Amino acid sequence: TIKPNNDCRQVNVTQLDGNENLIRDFLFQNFKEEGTVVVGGYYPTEVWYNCSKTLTTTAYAYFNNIHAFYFDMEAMENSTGNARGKPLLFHVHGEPVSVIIYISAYGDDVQHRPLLKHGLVCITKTRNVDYNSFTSSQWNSICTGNDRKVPFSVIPTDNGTKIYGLEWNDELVTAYISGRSYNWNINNNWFNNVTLMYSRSSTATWLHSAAYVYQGVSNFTYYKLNNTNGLKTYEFCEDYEYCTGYATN
Ligand SMILES: *[C@@H]1O[C@H](CO[C@@H]2O[C@@H](C)[C@@H](O)[C@@H](O)[C@@H]2O)[C@@H](O[C@@H]2O[C@H](CO)[C@@H](O)[C@H](O)[C@H]2NC(C)=O)[C@H](O)[C@H]1NC(C)=O
Ligand SMILES: *[C@@H]1O[C@H](CO)[C@@H](O[C@@H]2O[C@H](CO)[C@@H](O)[C@H](O)[C@H]2NC(C)=O)[C@H](O)[C@H]1NC(C)=O
Ligand SMILES: *[C@@H]1O[C@H](CO)[C@@H](O[C@@H]2O[C@H](CO)[C@@H](O)[C@H](O)[C@H]2NC(C)=O)[C@H](O)[C@H]1NC(C)=O
Ligand SMILES: *[C@@H]1O[C@H](CO)[C@@H](O[C@@H]2O[C@H](CO)[C@@H](O)[C@H](O)[C@H]2NC(C)=O)[C@H](O)[C@H]1NC(C)=O
Ligand SMILES: *[C@@H]1O[C@H](CO)[C@@H](O)[C@H](O)[C@H]1NC(C)=O
Ligand SMILES: *[C@@H]1O[C@H](CO)[C@@H](O)[C@H](O)[C@H]1NC(C)=O
Ligand SMILES: *[C@@H]1O[C@H](CO)[C@@H](O)[C@H](O)[C@H]1NC(C)=O
């Protein structure tokens, strides 16, 4: 879904440290009973992207025509206490309202940042956003003015074993964090693309590293979920005309 670039590579997300059950626990969020069902939606696939760059130059990645965006992180150091995070910024476009999601770095050292709340949501109406000023200034002056600022705490205790994500339609926005989903009723004209900043220089809130893998989802996917005697398994469905009736009946 990305515009082609030389700094982005493909990885198998489940074949990583701590991601043994990253996607299974996401698919089994709603089907908590025993038996077999079929679930359909903009669910993540096996192959994700890991964009990185050796040099310390601000880089970008562009995702075109996507209806969902998911990412996963590594385990934060000293997760039981003063956890030190890793940075990541991405912007979901739209009119008249767009959303900037920023995960700052470091721990209980960033000035005027609430303790153990590494995540920031900036709901904005401004058209052109300067990312250098956003990721190079102090936290108190990052998202100010007439924009809406919502700090939030990513979970350091999960050790990066939970998937983070976002999905948007013309009438609802769903945010998946920890093992929960939160809804937002808003009428905005989404452009269905995301601009991701994955590499920059070290600054007041940014730390040069690569600890995230991301994926944009554009297609509808159907999974067969089978829960037998506590053993939970999922499989891809190929027959589209058969799984649309299996998920509805
Ligand atoms: C790992 O973090 C712990 C806990 O951090 C403390 O509690 C957090 C919730 C937050 O308020 C932090 O700012 C706190 O520091 C650290 O334990 C502290 O260690 C210092 C060492 O000088 C000690 O003075 C404090 O009393 C300790 N606090 C507690 C609550 O026990 C610990 O040092 C960190 N480990 C490493 C290796 O950095
Ligand atoms: C995301 O998609 C939007 C779709 O609106 C793109 O913005 C439009 O780009 C076209 C290019 O021909 C312009 O004609 C429109 O005026 C733009 N609309 C705006 C700016 O509201 C946007 O460029 C895309 N962003 C990407 C690919 O990063
Ligand atoms: C994405 O791929 C990059 C490749 O650059 C990985 O970077 C490696 O990170 C480790 C741990 O810090 C370093 O020791 C290696 O030297 C890096 N590899 C290089 C520079 O080629 C990065 O870990 C990957 N991101 C993940 C798996 O989340
Ligand atoms: C869900 O998984 C279970 C295994 O836990 C499958 O159970 C099999 O059922 C067949 C048909 O009765 C038996 O012959 C096999 O011995 C069972 N397998 C095991 C390992 O016990 C069950 O079929 C699966 N459901 C679907 C729809 O594939
Ligand atoms: C994922 O694993 C499969 C099976 O081994 C392999 O063919 C594929 O290349 C892997 N994808 C990667 C390494 O991006
Ligand atoms: C995360 O790891 C820590 C030790 O590093 C452990 O105490 C904690 O239970 C782990 N959390 C999960 C969800 O596995
Ligand atoms: C997504 O669906 C399109 C048709 O809309 C198809 O051509 C394409 O192969 C699909 N991509 C993936 C990754 O499944």
Author numbering: 18 to 266
What text comes from the article?
FCoV-23 is a recently emerged, highly pathogenic recombinant coronavirus responsible for a widespread outbreak of feline infectious peritonitis. All coronaviruses are decorated with several copies of a homotrimeric spike (S) glycoprotein that is the target of neutralizing antibodies, drives viral entry through receptor binding and membrane fusion and contributes to pathogenesis. FCoV-23 S-long comprises an amino-terminal S1 subunit, folding as five domains designated 0 and A–D, and a C-terminal S2 subunit. Collectively, these findings identify APN as a bona fide entry receptor for FCoV-23, which seems to have broad receptor species tropism, mirroring that of CCoV-HuPn-2018.
To reveal the 3D organization of the infection machinery of FCoV-23, we determined cryogenic electron microscopy (cryo-EM) structures of a prefusion-stabilized S glycoprotein ectodomain trimer construct comprising D0, which we designated ‘S-long’. 3D classification of the cryo-EM data revealed the presence of two distinct S protein conformations: one with a population of trimers with three D0 regions swung out, and the other with a population of trimers with two D0 regions swung out and one D0 region in a proximal conformation. The structure with mixed D0 conformations (b) is rendered from a composite model of the global S and local D0 refinements. Furthermore, the alphacoronavirus-specific S glycoprotein domain 0 (D0) mediates attachment to host cell-surface carbohydrates, which may facilitate the entry process. Most alphacoronavirus S glycoproteins have a D0, not present in other coronavirus genera, that most probably arose through the duplication of domain A (the latter domain is often referred to as the N-terminal domain for betacoronaviruses).
